[PDB]
Protein backbone atom coordinates (compact mmCIF):
# COMPACT_ATOMS: atom_id res chain seq x y z
CA UNK A 1 0.00 0.00 0.00
CA UNK A 2 1.31 3.43 -1.02
CA UNK A 3 0.51 4.92 2.40
CA UNK A 4 2.51 2.21 4.22
CA UNK A 5 5.42 2.51 1.81
CA UNK A 6 5.52 6.28 2.43
CA UNK A 7 5.22 6.10 6.18
CA UNK A 8 7.89 3.38 6.43
CA UNK A 9 10.36 5.15 4.09
CA UNK A 10 9.96 8.53 5.82
CA UNK A 11 10.52 6.92 9.18
CA UNK A 12 13.51 4.92 8.10
CA UNK A 13 15.11 8.00 6.44
CA UNK A 14 14.67 9.93 9.63
CA UNK A 15 16.17 7.14 11.82
CA UNK A 16 19.17 7.07 9.45
CA UNK A 17 19.71 10.75 10.25
CA UNK A 18 18.42 12.44 7.09
CA UNK A 19 16.24 15.52 7.03
CA UNK A 20 14.18 15.07 3.89
CA UNK A 21 12.03 17.92 2.53
CA UNK A 22 9.43 18.18 -0.30
CA UNK A 23 10.36 20.91 -2.73
CA UNK A 24 7.83 21.16 -5.53
CA UNK A 25 4.78 19.31 -6.74
CA UNK A 26 3.22 19.12 -10.18
CA UNK A 27 -0.01 17.75 -11.65
CA UNK A 28 0.29 18.92 -15.32
CA UNK A 29 -2.49 16.73 -16.76
CA UNK A 30 -5.05 14.34 -15.23
CA UNK A 31 -3.54 11.15 -13.77
CA UNK A 32 0.04 12.44 -13.83
CA UNK A 33 2.06 13.79 -10.91
CA UNK A 34 5.59 14.42 -9.83
CA UNK A 35 7.48 15.73 -6.83
CA UNK A 36 11.01 16.85 -6.05
CA UNK A 37 12.49 15.80 -2.72
CA UNK A 38 15.74 17.09 -1.22
CA UNK A 39 18.18 16.54 1.70
CA UNK A 40 17.82 19.63 3.86
CA UNK A 41 21.56 19.36 4.73
CA UNK A 42 23.09 18.40 1.35
CA UNK A 43 22.06 20.11 -1.88
CA UNK A 44 23.46 17.31 -4.03
CA UNK A 45 21.29 14.54 -2.50
CA UNK A 46 17.85 14.78 -4.15
CA UNK A 47 15.32 12.73 -6.13
CA UNK A 48 12.31 13.02 -8.42
CA UNK A 49 9.19 10.96 -8.00
CA UNK A 50 6.48 10.38 -10.59
CA UNK A 51 3.23 8.43 -10.64
CA UNK A 52 -0.43 8.60 -11.66
CA UNK A 53 -1.69 9.75 -8.22
CA UNK A 54 -0.08 12.19 -5.76
CA UNK A 55 0.97 9.47 -3.29
CA UNK A 56 2.22 7.18 -6.06
CA UNK A 57 4.67 10.02 -6.90
CA UNK A 58 5.78 10.66 -3.32
CA UNK A 59 6.35 6.93 -2.81
CA UNK A 60 8.35 6.98 -6.07
CA UNK A 61 10.46 9.93 -4.90
CA UNK A 62 11.23 8.18 -1.60
CA UNK A 63 11.86 4.82 -3.22
CA UNK A 64 14.36 6.45 -5.59
CA UNK A 65 15.87 8.05 -2.47
CA UNK A 66 16.67 4.59 -1.00
CA UNK A 67 17.68 3.28 -4.47
CA UNK A 68 20.35 6.03 -4.60
CA UNK A 69 21.59 5.90 -1.05
CA UNK A 70 21.73 2.10 -1.08
CA UNK A 71 23.79 2.10 -4.31
CA UNK A 72 25.87 5.13 -3.23
CA UNK A 73 24.88 6.76 -6.53
CA UNK A 74 24.60 10.29 -5.14
CA UNK A 75 28.35 10.22 -4.46
CA UNK A 76 29.26 8.45 -7.72
CA UNK A 77 30.51 11.58 -9.50
CA UNK A 78 32.80 12.74 -6.71
CA UNK A 79 36.15 11.92 -5.11
CA UNK A 80 35.49 11.32 -1.40
CA UNK A 81 38.80 12.68 -0.15
CA UNK A 82 41.93 11.18 1.31
CA UNK A 83 40.54 10.11 4.67
CA UNK A 84 37.61 8.07 3.29
CA UNK A 85 39.87 6.74 0.51
CA UNK A 86 42.29 5.32 3.07
CA UNK A 87 39.57 4.19 5.56
CA UNK A 88 38.47 0.66 6.59
CA UNK A 89 36.11 0.44 3.60
CA UNK A 90 35.28 3.04 0.95
CA UNK A 91 32.21 1.68 -0.83
CA UNK A 92 30.89 -1.28 1.19
CA UNK A 93 32.38 -3.49 3.95
CA UNK A 94 32.06 -6.54 1.64
CA UNK A 95 34.02 -4.78 -1.16
CA UNK A 96 37.35 -6.29 -2.17
CA UNK A 97 40.62 -4.64 -3.18
CA UNK A 98 42.88 -6.17 -5.84
CA UNK A 99 46.35 -4.63 -5.97
CA UNK A 100 47.81 -3.75 -9.34
CA UNK A 101 50.09 -6.38 -10.90
CA UNK A 102 53.70 -5.90 -12.08
CA UNK A 103 52.85 -5.93 -15.82
CA UNK A 104 49.53 -4.14 -15.05
CA UNK A 105 47.10 -6.85 -16.28
CA UNK A 106 43.64 -6.96 -14.68
CA UNK A 107 44.08 -9.05 -11.53
CA UNK A 108 42.72 -12.57 -11.67
CA UNK A 109 40.06 -12.54 -8.91
CA UNK A 110 38.17 -9.82 -10.79
CA UNK A 111 35.35 -10.19 -13.25
CA UNK A 112 34.75 -13.60 -14.70
CA UNK A 113 35.51 -15.07 -18.17
CA UNK A 114 32.49 -13.87 -20.15
CA UNK A 115 32.84 -10.38 -18.73
CA UNK A 116 36.56 -10.24 -19.61
CA UNK A 117 35.61 -11.21 -23.18
CA UNK A 118 32.91 -8.55 -23.41
CA UNK A 119 34.68 -5.55 -21.79
CA UNK A 120 38.08 -6.39 -23.19
CA UNK A 121 38.01 -8.60 -26.27
CA UNK A 122 41.51 -7.58 -27.44
CA UNK A 123 42.94 -8.33 -23.99
CA UNK A 124 44.57 -4.84 -23.85
CA UNK A 125 42.75 -3.48 -20.80
CA UNK A 126 45.23 -2.45 -18.08
CA UNK A 127 44.59 -2.61 -14.30
CA UNK A 128 45.54 1.01 -13.50
CA UNK A 129 42.77 2.22 -15.85
CA UNK A 130 40.21 0.54 -13.43
CA UNK A 131 40.90 2.63 -10.31
CA UNK A 132 37.57 3.76 -8.85
CA UNK A 133 36.91 7.53 -8.75
CA UNK A 134 35.65 7.79 -5.18
CA UNK A 135 38.94 6.65 -3.63
CA UNK A 136 41.43 7.43 -6.41
CA UNK A 137 43.64 5.10 -4.39
CA UNK A 138 46.01 3.50 -6.86
CA UNK A 139 48.23 2.11 -4.09
CA UNK A 140 45.31 0.28 -2.50
CA UNK A 141 44.32 -0.97 -5.92
CA UNK A 142 41.21 -1.80 -7.84
CA UNK A 143 38.07 -1.74 -5.74
CA UNK A 144 35.68 -4.47 -6.86
CA UNK A 145 32.10 -4.94 -5.71
CA UNK A 146 30.38 -8.26 -5.15
CA UNK A 147 27.57 -9.36 -7.51
CA UNK A 148 25.67 -12.63 -7.41
CA UNK A 149 25.95 -14.18 -10.88
CA UNK A 150 22.47 -15.56 -11.35
CA UNK A 151 22.78 -18.74 -13.39
CA UNK A 152 25.03 -20.49 -10.84
CA UNK A 153 24.47 -18.28 -7.77
CA UNK A 154 28.23 -17.52 -7.44
CA UNK A 155 29.77 -14.21 -6.37
CA UNK A 156 31.65 -12.18 -8.98
CA UNK A 157 33.77 -9.12 -8.26
CA UNK A 158 33.21 -6.21 -10.71
CA UNK A 159 35.49 -3.14 -10.48
CA UNK A 160 33.63 -0.10 -9.26
CA UNK A 161 35.27 1.78 -12.13
CA UNK A 162 33.52 -0.45 -14.70
CA UNK A 163 30.14 -0.43 -12.93
CA UNK A 164 30.14 3.33 -12.70
CA UNK A 165 31.42 4.26 -16.13
CA UNK A 166 29.26 1.95 -18.21
CA UNK A 167 26.14 1.23 -16.20
CA UNK A 168 25.62 4.35 -14.06
CA UNK A 169 22.08 4.61 -12.67
CA UNK A 170 20.78 1.85 -14.94
CA UNK A 171 19.11 -1.21 -13.51
CA UNK A 172 19.04 0.12 -9.98
CA UNK A 173 15.99 -0.20 -7.91
CA UNK A 174 14.54 -0.15 -4.42
CA UNK A 175 11.29 -1.71 -3.25
CA UNK A 176 8.90 -2.96 -0.62
CA UNK A 177 10.12 -6.53 -1.25
CA UNK A 178 13.19 -8.18 -2.73
CA UNK A 179 11.19 -9.25 -5.83
CA UNK A 180 9.24 -6.02 -6.35
CA UNK A 181 12.59 -4.15 -6.55
CA UNK A 182 14.17 -6.69 -8.87
CA UNK A 183 11.21 -6.72 -11.25
CA UNK A 184 11.36 -2.90 -11.37
CA UNK A 185 15.13 -2.99 -12.01
CA UNK A 186 15.02 -5.79 -14.63
CA UNK A 187 12.24 -4.01 -16.42
CA UNK A 188 14.44 -0.81 -16.29
CA UNK A 189 16.99 -2.91 -18.21
CA UNK A 190 14.50 -3.89 -20.93
CA UNK A 191 13.21 -0.30 -21.17
CA UNK A 192 16.63 1.00 -22.04
CA UNK A 193 17.93 -1.94 -24.16
CA UNK A 194 14.83 -2.10 -26.36
CA UNK A 195 14.75 1.70 -26.56
CA UNK A 196 18.30 1.77 -27.90
CA UNK A 197 17.32 -0.73 -30.58
CA UNK A 198 14.09 0.89 -31.61
CA UNK A 199 16.01 4.18 -31.91
CA UNK A 200 19.38 3.17 -33.33
CA UNK A 201 17.90 0.69 -35.80
CA UNK A 202 15.29 3.31 -36.91
CA UNK A 203 12.42 0.88 -36.31
CA UNK A 204 8.75 1.58 -37.20
CA UNK A 205 6.63 0.40 -34.33
CA UNK A 206 2.96 -0.66 -34.44
CA UNK A 207 0.29 1.58 -32.90
CA UNK A 208 -1.56 0.32 -29.86
CA UNK A 209 -5.20 -0.27 -30.99
CA UNK A 210 -7.81 2.08 -29.53
CA UNK A 211 -9.89 -0.68 -27.86
CA UNK A 212 -6.70 -1.83 -26.09
CA UNK A 213 -5.96 1.68 -24.77
CA UNK A 214 -9.61 1.75 -23.66
CA UNK A 215 -8.76 -0.76 -20.94
CA UNK A 216 -6.76 1.97 -19.20
CA UNK A 217 -9.10 5.03 -19.06
CA UNK A 218 -6.88 6.98 -16.63
CA UNK A 219 -4.08 6.95 -19.24
CA UNK A 220 -6.54 7.62 -22.10
CA UNK A 221 -7.60 10.70 -20.12
CA UNK A 222 -4.01 11.89 -19.74
CA UNK A 223 -3.57 11.52 -23.50
CA UNK A 224 -6.82 13.22 -24.52
CA UNK A 225 -5.80 16.15 -22.33
CA UNK A 226 -2.35 16.40 -23.89
CA UNK A 227 -3.88 16.04 -27.36
CA UNK A 228 -6.54 18.71 -26.82
CA UNK A 229 -3.82 20.85 -25.21
CA UNK A 230 -2.22 20.91 -28.70
CA UNK A 231 0.22 17.95 -28.49
CA UNK A 232 -0.20 15.03 -30.88
CA UNK A 233 0.49 11.69 -29.15
CA UNK A 234 1.54 8.28 -30.59
CA UNK A 235 1.20 5.17 -28.46
CA UNK A 236 3.26 2.15 -29.59
CA UNK A 237 3.95 -1.51 -28.84
CA UNK A 238 7.68 -1.68 -28.15
CA UNK A 239 7.65 -5.46 -27.65
CA UNK A 240 9.20 -6.04 -31.09
CA UNK A 241 6.65 -8.75 -31.90
CA UNK A 242 5.82 -9.80 -28.34
CA UNK A 243 9.45 -10.44 -27.20
CA UNK A 244 9.96 -7.72 -24.60
CA UNK A 245 7.61 -5.99 -22.14
CA UNK A 246 8.14 -2.48 -23.53
CA UNK A 247 5.72 0.33 -24.43
CA UNK A 248 6.83 3.45 -26.29
CA UNK A 249 4.86 6.68 -26.43
CA UNK A 250 5.85 9.69 -28.45
CA UNK A 251 4.76 13.33 -28.01
CA UNK A 252 4.83 15.92 -30.82
CA UNK A 253 5.18 19.64 -30.24
CA UNK A 254 3.92 21.32 -33.43
CA UNK A 255 4.83 24.75 -32.08
CA UNK A 256 8.53 23.90 -32.23
CA UNK A 257 8.33 21.06 -34.76
CA UNK A 258 9.95 18.68 -32.27
CA UNK A 259 9.18 15.25 -30.81
CA UNK A 260 9.85 13.59 -27.49
CA UNK A 261 9.96 9.77 -27.22
CA UNK A 262 9.32 8.06 -23.90
CA UNK A 263 9.75 4.39 -23.14
CA UNK A 264 8.72 2.13 -20.31
CA UNK A 265 8.72 -1.47 -19.27
CA UNK A 266 6.90 -3.72 -16.88
CA UNK A 267 5.61 -7.29 -17.09
CA UNK A 268 2.02 -5.99 -16.96
CA UNK A 269 1.14 -4.16 -20.20
CA UNK A 270 -1.03 -1.61 -18.38
CA UNK A 271 1.60 -0.64 -15.82
CA UNK A 272 4.13 -0.28 -18.60
CA UNK A 273 1.77 1.94 -20.54
CA UNK A 274 1.23 4.28 -17.60
CA UNK A 275 4.90 4.33 -16.71
CA UNK A 276 5.73 5.46 -20.23
CA UNK A 277 3.05 8.21 -20.16
CA UNK A 278 3.89 9.55 -16.69
CA UNK A 279 7.50 9.94 -17.78
CA UNK A 280 6.36 12.87 -20.12
CA UNK A 281 13.51 18.90 -27.68
CA UNK A 282 14.80 17.93 -31.15
CA UNK A 283 12.91 17.34 -34.39
CA UNK A 284 12.82 13.91 -36.06
CA UNK A 285 15.38 13.14 -38.72
CA UNK A 286 16.02 10.98 -41.76
CA UNK A 287 19.68 10.61 -40.74
CA UNK A 288 20.02 6.89 -40.40
CA UNK A 289 23.64 7.31 -39.11
CA UNK A 290 23.25 10.23 -36.68
CA UNK A 291 20.39 8.52 -34.82
CA UNK A 292 22.42 5.33 -34.29
CA UNK A 293 25.55 7.23 -33.03
CA UNK A 294 26.44 6.18 -29.44
CA UNK A 295 26.42 9.87 -28.37
CA UNK A 296 22.75 10.12 -29.43
CA UNK A 297 21.62 7.19 -27.28
CA UNK A 298 23.87 8.41 -24.44
CA UNK A 299 21.91 11.72 -24.60
CA UNK A 300 18.52 9.99 -24.62
CA UNK A 301 19.53 8.40 -21.31
CA UNK A 302 20.59 11.62 -19.50
CA UNK A 303 17.54 13.60 -20.66
CA UNK A 304 15.31 12.49 -23.56
CA UNK A 305 16.25 15.35 -25.95
CA UNK A 306 17.84 13.08 -28.56
CA UNK A 307 17.32 12.36 -32.24
CA UNK A 308 14.44 10.08 -33.30
CA UNK A 309 14.12 8.71 -36.87
CA UNK A 310 11.05 9.70 -38.91
CA UNK A 311 10.80 5.96 -39.56
CA UNK A 312 9.32 5.40 -36.12
CA UNK A 313 6.12 7.06 -37.41
CA UNK A 314 5.82 5.18 -40.70
CA UNK A 315 2.38 3.84 -41.33
CA UNK A 316 3.67 0.31 -41.96
CA UNK A 317 5.31 -1.20 -38.87
CA UNK A 318 8.18 -3.71 -38.95
CA UNK A 319 6.51 -5.84 -36.24
CA UNK A 320 2.85 -6.57 -35.68
CA UNK A 321 1.07 -5.29 -32.58
CA UNK A 322 0.93 -7.92 -29.88
CA UNK A 323 -1.44 -7.69 -26.98
CA UNK A 324 1.28 -8.88 -24.64
CA UNK A 325 1.23 -9.77 -20.99
CA UNK A 326 3.88 -11.21 -18.68
CA UNK A 327 2.14 -10.35 -15.39
CA UNK A 328 1.53 -12.23 -12.09
CA UNK A 329 3.01 -12.00 -8.59
CA UNK A 330 6.37 -10.22 -8.25
CA UNK A 331 7.88 -13.65 -7.62
CA UNK A 332 6.46 -15.08 -10.88
CA UNK A 333 7.23 -11.88 -12.81
CA UNK A 334 10.86 -12.14 -11.65
CA UNK A 335 11.10 -15.65 -13.11
CA UNK A 336 9.25 -14.74 -16.31
CA UNK A 337 11.65 -11.88 -16.97
CA UNK A 338 14.70 -13.92 -16.03
CA UNK A 339 13.39 -16.49 -18.56
CA UNK A 340 13.78 -13.87 -21.31
CA UNK A 341 17.39 -13.19 -20.34
CA UNK A 342 18.12 -16.92 -20.39
CA UNK A 343 16.52 -17.15 -23.83
CA UNK A 344 18.91 -14.38 -24.97
CA UNK A 345 21.99 -16.18 -23.59
CA UNK A 346 22.67 -13.17 -21.33
CA UNK A 347 24.04 -13.61 -17.84
CA UNK A 348 22.36 -11.46 -15.22
CA UNK A 349 24.44 -10.17 -12.26
CA UNK A 350 22.54 -8.85 -9.26
CA UNK A 351 23.81 -7.18 -6.10
CA UNK A 352 21.61 -6.77 -3.02
CA UNK A 353 21.68 -3.99 -0.48
CA UNK A 354 19.61 -4.02 2.71
CA UNK A 355 21.86 -1.97 4.99
CA UNK A 356 19.48 1.01 5.02
CA UNK A 357 16.45 -1.08 6.04
CA UNK A 358 14.92 -1.18 2.60
CA UNK A 359 15.75 -3.64 -0.09
CA UNK A 360 17.58 -2.26 -3.07
CA UNK A 361 19.28 -4.06 -5.96
CA UNK A 362 21.73 -3.20 -8.67
CA UNK A 363 21.55 -5.19 -11.90
CA UNK A 364 24.24 -5.58 -14.54
CA UNK A 365 23.45 -7.56 -17.74
CA UNK A 366 26.47 -7.02 -19.96
CA UNK A 367 25.37 -6.82 -23.58
CA UNK A 368 22.02 -5.20 -22.56
CA UNK A 369 22.28 -3.07 -19.39
CA UNK A 370 25.20 -1.06 -20.84
CA UNK A 371 24.57 2.65 -21.39
CA UNK A 372 28.08 3.49 -22.44
CA UNK A 373 30.23 1.19 -24.61
CA UNK A 374 33.30 -0.57 -23.21
CA UNK A 375 35.64 1.47 -25.44
CA UNK A 376 34.86 4.29 -23.05
CA UNK A 377 37.02 2.59 -20.32
CA UNK A 378 39.93 3.77 -22.52
CA UNK A 379 38.51 6.90 -24.14
CA UNK A 380 36.05 8.38 -21.62
CA UNK A 381 37.00 6.99 -18.25
CA UNK A 382 35.67 9.08 -15.40
CA UNK A 383 38.88 8.68 -13.39
CA UNK A 384 41.23 9.63 -16.26
CA UNK A 385 42.11 12.76 -14.34
CA UNK A 386 42.46 11.16 -10.87
CA UNK A 387 46.28 11.38 -11.10
CA UNK A 388 46.43 15.15 -11.81
CA UNK A 389 44.07 16.00 -8.92
CA UNK A 390 46.69 16.77 -6.28
CA UNK A 391 48.79 18.74 -8.76
CA UNK A 392 45.87 20.87 -9.92
CA UNK A 393 44.38 21.54 -6.47
CA UNK A 394 47.82 22.78 -5.37
CA UNK A 395 47.94 25.49 -8.08
CA UNK A 396 46.24 28.33 -6.13
CA UNK A 397 49.09 29.60 -3.95
CA UNK A 398 51.72 27.50 -5.74
CA UNK A 399 55.03 29.18 -6.65
CA UNK A 400 56.65 26.82 -9.14
CA UNK A 401 58.94 27.73 -12.00
CA UNK A 402 57.45 29.20 -15.16
CA UNK A 403 58.41 26.17 -17.21
CA UNK A 404 56.48 23.81 -14.90
CA UNK A 405 53.27 25.76 -15.51
CA UNK A 406 53.75 25.82 -19.28
CA UNK A 407 54.42 22.04 -19.28
CA UNK A 408 51.26 21.16 -17.45
CA UNK A 409 49.46 22.75 -20.46
CA UNK A 410 51.36 20.56 -22.92
CA UNK A 411 50.62 17.55 -20.65
CA UNK A 412 46.89 18.29 -20.69
CA UNK A 413 47.19 18.35 -24.52
CA UNK A 414 49.30 15.18 -24.75
CA UNK A 415 46.93 13.33 -22.44
CA UNK A 416 44.14 14.41 -24.78
CA UNK A 417 41.74 16.14 -22.38
CA UNK A 418 38.88 18.07 -23.99
CA UNK A 419 39.07 21.87 -23.56
CA UNK A 420 35.35 22.02 -22.76
CA UNK A 421 35.58 19.48 -19.91
CA UNK A 422 34.61 20.83 -16.51
CA UNK A 423 37.54 20.52 -14.12
CA UNK A 424 35.26 20.01 -11.15
CA UNK A 425 33.69 17.00 -12.94
CA UNK A 426 37.10 15.63 -14.02
CA UNK A 427 38.44 15.61 -10.45
CA UNK A 428 35.17 14.82 -8.68
CA UNK A 429 34.82 18.07 -6.79
CA UNK A 430 31.56 19.31 -5.30
CA UNK A 431 32.68 22.89 -5.34
CA UNK A 432 29.32 24.61 -4.73
CA UNK A 433 28.16 27.56 -6.85
CA UNK A 434 29.97 30.45 -5.19
CA UNK A 435 33.59 30.24 -6.46
CA UNK A 436 35.87 29.92 -9.47
CA UNK A 437 36.11 26.10 -9.51
CA UNK A 438 32.38 25.74 -10.15
CA UNK A 439 32.69 26.96 -13.77
CA UNK A 440 36.37 26.19 -14.39
CA UNK A 441 36.93 24.34 -17.65
CA UNK A 442 40.15 23.00 -19.12
CA UNK A 443 40.40 25.92 -21.56
CA UNK A 444 40.17 28.42 -18.78
CA UNK A 445 42.75 26.44 -16.76
CA UNK A 446 45.09 26.64 -19.70
CA UNK A 447 44.69 30.47 -19.67
CA UNK A 448 45.47 30.48 -15.97
CA UNK A 449 48.62 28.41 -16.50
CA UNK A 450 49.85 30.48 -19.44
CA UNK A 451 49.60 33.49 -17.10
CA UNK A 452 51.48 31.84 -14.25
CA UNK A 453 54.16 30.70 -16.71
CA UNK A 454 54.23 34.14 -18.26
CA UNK A 455 53.31 33.29 -21.85
CA UNK A 456 50.94 36.17 -22.53
CA UNK A 457 50.28 35.24 -26.18
CA UNK A 458 48.78 31.88 -25.17
CA UNK A 459 47.09 33.41 -22.17
CA UNK A 460 45.17 35.73 -24.52
CA UNK A 461 44.04 32.88 -26.78
CA UNK A 462 42.49 30.95 -23.89
CA UNK A 463 41.16 34.06 -22.14
CA UNK A 464 39.23 34.84 -25.34
CA UNK A 465 38.13 31.18 -25.52
CA UNK A 466 37.08 31.37 -21.90
CA UNK A 467 34.81 34.33 -22.44
CA UNK A 468 33.42 33.05 -25.70
CA UNK A 469 32.18 29.88 -23.94
CA UNK A 470 31.81 30.57 -20.22
CA UNK A 471 30.91 34.25 -19.68
CA UNK A 472 27.19 33.53 -19.90
CA UNK A 473 27.45 31.43 -16.67
CA UNK A 474 30.09 33.37 -14.77
CA UNK A 475 28.99 35.60 -11.90
CA UNK A 476 28.86 39.31 -12.72
CA UNK A 477 32.08 39.75 -10.70
CA UNK A 478 33.98 37.04 -12.47
CA UNK A 479 32.74 37.92 -15.94
CA UNK A 480 33.92 41.46 -15.31
CA UNK A 481 37.34 40.24 -14.14
CA UNK A 482 37.67 38.33 -17.43
CA UNK A 483 36.64 41.37 -19.49
CA UNK A 484 39.35 43.39 -17.75
CA UNK A 485 42.06 40.72 -18.00
CA UNK A 486 41.24 40.39 -21.63
CA UNK A 487 41.65 44.10 -22.24
CA UNK A 488 45.01 44.20 -20.45
CA UNK A 489 46.23 41.22 -22.46
CA UNK A 490 45.21 42.92 -25.65
CA UNK A 491 47.01 46.08 -24.47
CA UNK A 492 50.10 44.06 -23.77
CA UNK A 493 50.08 43.24 -27.48
CA UNK A 494 50.04 46.92 -28.38
CA UNK A 495 53.76 47.72 -28.15
CA UNK A 496 53.13 51.31 -29.32
CA UNK A 497 50.78 52.14 -26.46
CA UNK A 498 51.62 53.28 -22.91
CA UNK A 499 49.73 51.25 -20.24
CA UNK A 500 49.73 54.18 -17.80
CA UNK A 501 47.68 56.30 -20.15
CA UNK A 502 44.75 53.88 -20.05
CA UNK A 503 44.92 53.14 -16.35
CA UNK A 504 42.35 55.71 -15.20
CA UNK A 505 39.86 54.54 -17.83
CA UNK A 506 40.27 50.87 -16.84
CA UNK A 507 39.68 51.59 -13.19
CA UNK A 508 36.47 53.37 -14.15
CA UNK A 509 35.13 50.63 -16.39
CA UNK A 510 36.16 47.53 -14.44
CA UNK A 511 36.67 48.80 -10.90
CA UNK A 512 39.91 48.97 -8.97
CA UNK A 513 39.68 45.46 -7.38
CA UNK A 514 39.25 43.88 -10.79
CA UNK A 515 42.23 45.80 -12.31
CA UNK A 516 44.53 45.01 -9.39
CA UNK A 517 43.65 41.31 -9.70
CA UNK A 518 44.02 41.09 -13.47
CA UNK A 519 47.48 42.71 -13.15
CA UNK A 520 48.60 40.26 -10.48
CA UNK A 521 47.42 37.53 -12.82
CA UNK A 522 49.50 38.95 -15.72
CA UNK A 523 52.62 39.31 -13.57
CA UNK A 524 52.29 35.55 -12.95
CA UNK A 525 51.79 36.29 -9.27
CA UNK A 526 48.19 35.33 -8.63
CA UNK A 527 47.13 33.75 -11.93
CA UNK A 528 44.47 31.46 -10.58
CA UNK A 529 41.74 34.00 -10.04
CA UNK A 530 38.87 33.01 -7.83
CA UNK A 531 40.36 29.58 -7.17
CA UNK A 532 40.98 29.07 -3.46
CA UNK A 533 43.54 26.42 -2.58
CA UNK A 534 42.09 22.98 -1.76
CA UNK A 535 43.25 20.55 0.92
CA UNK A 536 42.99 16.87 0.11
CA UNK A 537 39.90 16.42 2.29
CA UNK A 538 38.07 19.23 0.44
CA UNK A 539 37.57 21.38 3.56
CA UNK A 540 37.95 24.33 1.21
CA UNK A 541 34.53 23.44 -0.31
CA UNK A 542 31.63 23.64 2.12
CA UNK A 543 29.45 21.90 -0.48
CA UNK A 544 31.75 18.92 -0.49
CA UNK A 545 31.84 18.88 3.28
CA UNK A 546 28.05 18.55 3.28
CA UNK A 547 28.47 15.62 0.86
CA UNK A 548 30.93 13.84 3.12
CA UNK A 549 28.75 14.42 6.18
CA UNK A 550 25.97 12.71 4.33
CA UNK A 551 28.19 9.79 3.35
CA UNK A 552 29.32 9.34 6.98
CA UNK A 553 25.67 8.56 7.80
CA UNK A 554 25.77 5.72 5.28
CA UNK A 555 29.18 4.36 6.43
CA UNK A 556 27.90 4.01 9.96
CA UNK A 557 24.71 2.36 8.70
CA UNK A 558 26.88 -0.10 6.79
CA UNK A 559 28.54 -1.18 10.03
Ligand X SMILES: Nc1ncnc2c1ncn2[C@@H]1O[C@H](COP(=O)(O)CP(=O)(O)OP(=O)(O)O)[C@@H](O)[C@H]1O
Cβ neighbours of residue 513 under 8 Å, at least 6 residues apart? Answer: none
Query: Is residue 93 close enough to count as binding a copy of itself by CB under 8 A?
Result: no
Q: Which stretch binds a copy of itself (CB under 8 A): 82-90, 384-392, 401-409, 503-511?
A: 503-511
Residues 16/553, Cβ–Cβ less than 8 Å: yes
319: contact with a copy of itself by CB under 8 A: no
Q: In this complex, which beta carbon is closest to ligand X, that of residue 130 or of residue 350?
A: 350
Could you tell which of ligand X, a copy of itself, Mg ion, none binds residue 433, using a CB distance below 5 to 8 A set by kind?
A: none
Alpha carbon distance 308, 454 (integer Å)? 49
Member of 511, 536, 537, 558 binding a copy of itself (CB under 8 A): 511
CA angle, 103 then 107 then 112, to 5°: 140
Per CB under 5 A, which of residues 307..326 are in contact with Mg ion? 314, 317
* 362: phi then psi, degrees, rounded to nearest 5: -140, 125
292 touching a copy of itself, by CB under 8 A: no
| Diameter over CA atoms, the chain | 84
Interface residue with a copy of itself among 508, 539, 549, 556 (CB under 8 A) is 508
Whole-angstrom Cα distance, residue 429 to residue 413?
A: 22
| Partner from Mg ion, ligand X, a copy of itself, none binding residue 59, C-beta < 5-8 Å depending on class | ligand X
Query: What residue number has its CB nearest to ligand X?
Result: 63
Binding residues with a copy of itself: total (CB under 8 A): 37
74 touches a copy of itself by CB under 8 A: no
Q: Which does 370 bind (CB under 5 to 8 A by kind): a copy of itself, ligand X, Mg ion, none?
A: none
* Coil, strand or helix at 98: strand
Q: Supply angle C-alpha 237, 54, 282, rounded to 5.
A: 45
Instruction: Tell me which of a copy of itself, ligand X, Mg ion, none is bound by residue 477, counting a contact when its beta carbon lies within the kind-specific cut-off of 5 to 8 angstroms.
Output: none
Cβ within 8 Å of residue 267, ≥6 positions away: 183, 187, 245, 325, 326, 327, 328, 333, 336, 337
DSSP secondary structure string for all residues of 365-409: -TTTS-SS-TTHHHHS-TTTTGGGHHHHHHTTT----HHHHHHHH
Q: Minimal distance in Å, beta carbon 526 to a copy of itself?
A: 21
Residue from the set 490, 513, 552, 556 that interacts with a copy of itself by CB under 8 A: 490
Min CB(280)–a copy of itself separation in Å: 16
Residue choice 338, 491, 520, 542 for contact with a copy of itself (CB under 8 A): 491
d(CA 56, CA 271): 13
Q: Is 509 in the site for a copy of itself (CB under 8 A)?
A: yes
Strand-pairing partners, residue 360, are 174, 353
Burial 520-539 (b: 16+ CB within 10 A, else e): ebbebebbbbbbeebebbbe
CB of 176 to ligand X, least distance (A): 5
Smallest separation, CB 254 to a copy of itself (Å): 6
* Residue range at the interface with Mg ion (CB under 5 A); choices 122-130, 198-206, 243-251, 548-556: 198-206
Strand intervals (E) in 107-198:
142-149, 155-159, 172-175
> Which secondary structure element, helix H or strand E, spans residue 197, and what is its range?
helix 178-200
Shortest distance, position 121 Cβ to a copy of itself, whole Å: 33
Query: Bridge partners of 37?
Result: 22, 47
**Interface residue list for a copy of itself (CB under 8 A):** 204, 232, 234, 252, 254-255, 257, 259, 283-284, 286, 310-311, 313-316, 476, 480, 483-484, 487, 490-491, 493-494, 497, 500-505, 508-511
**Interface residue list for Mg ion (CB under 5 A):** 204, 314, 317
Amino acid sequence: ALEDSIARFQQKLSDLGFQIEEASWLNPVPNVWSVHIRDKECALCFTNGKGATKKAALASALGEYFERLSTNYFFADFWLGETIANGPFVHYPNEKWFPLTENDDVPEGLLDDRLRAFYDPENELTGSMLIDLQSGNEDRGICGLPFTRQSDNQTVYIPMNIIGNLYVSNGMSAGNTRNEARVQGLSEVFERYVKNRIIAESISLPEIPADVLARYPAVVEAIETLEAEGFPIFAYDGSLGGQYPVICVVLFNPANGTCFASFGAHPDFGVALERTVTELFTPPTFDDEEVAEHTNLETHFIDSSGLISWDLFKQDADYPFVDWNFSGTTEEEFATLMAIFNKEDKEVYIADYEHLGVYACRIIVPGMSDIYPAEDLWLANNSMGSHLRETILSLPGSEWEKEDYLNLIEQLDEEGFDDFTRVRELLGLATGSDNGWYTLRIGELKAMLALAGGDLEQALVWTEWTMEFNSSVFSPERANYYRCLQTLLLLAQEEDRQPLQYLNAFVRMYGADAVEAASAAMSGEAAFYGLQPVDSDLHAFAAHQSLLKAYEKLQRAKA
